[PDB]
Write a protein that binds this ligand. Structure first.
Ligand code: HEM
Length: 108
């Protein structure tokens, strides 16, 4: 065991496990509605919105330093406000790139 290595371990997973986003061949550039995000709270994926980017955060759960219980609060909703309350400086754009499923379009 080595303290502090969760993010290194996470990124190794993103380099060595295919389709963490769970897109199953769909491209990660799709325009997504919030109603769609809301319907990914259970099952094989959990979607959230951060600054307009939609991510499948289910694979990240056990790597989140703040805990699974905290990350679950983001399930099926826009979690930007929560993210900014706890750590607005975290580089989610880089850390979660391989979990990107698309972009939140308010008009969809
Ligand atoms: C969704 C993408 C998220 C990522 C990539 C992420 C990443 C991280 C990281 C790297 C840390 C360690 C502290 C640091 O490096 O600054 C952390 C801590 C923490 N996270 Fe997250 N986090 C996410 C979402 C959330 C959400 C939605 C919540 C709450 C609902 C949350 C709650 C916390 C808490 C409580 C801590 C410890 C205290 C704090 O830093 O405020 N995280 N997170």
């Amino acid at each position: 065991f080595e303290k502090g290595y969760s993010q290194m371990d996470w990124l190794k997973l993103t380099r060595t496990h295919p389709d963490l986003a769970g897109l199953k061949g769909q491209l990660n550039r799709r325009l997504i509605s919030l109603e769609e995000v809301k319907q990914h709270k259970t099952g094989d994926s959990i979607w959230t919105v951060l600054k307009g980017r939609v991510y499948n955060i289910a694979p990240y759960m056990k790597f989140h330093p703040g805990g699974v219980d905290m990350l679950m609060k983001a399930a099926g909703k826009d979690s930007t406000a929560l993210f900014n309350k706890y750590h607005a400086w975290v580089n989610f754009e880089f850390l979660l790139e391989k979990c990107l499923v698309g972009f939140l379009d308010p008009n969809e």
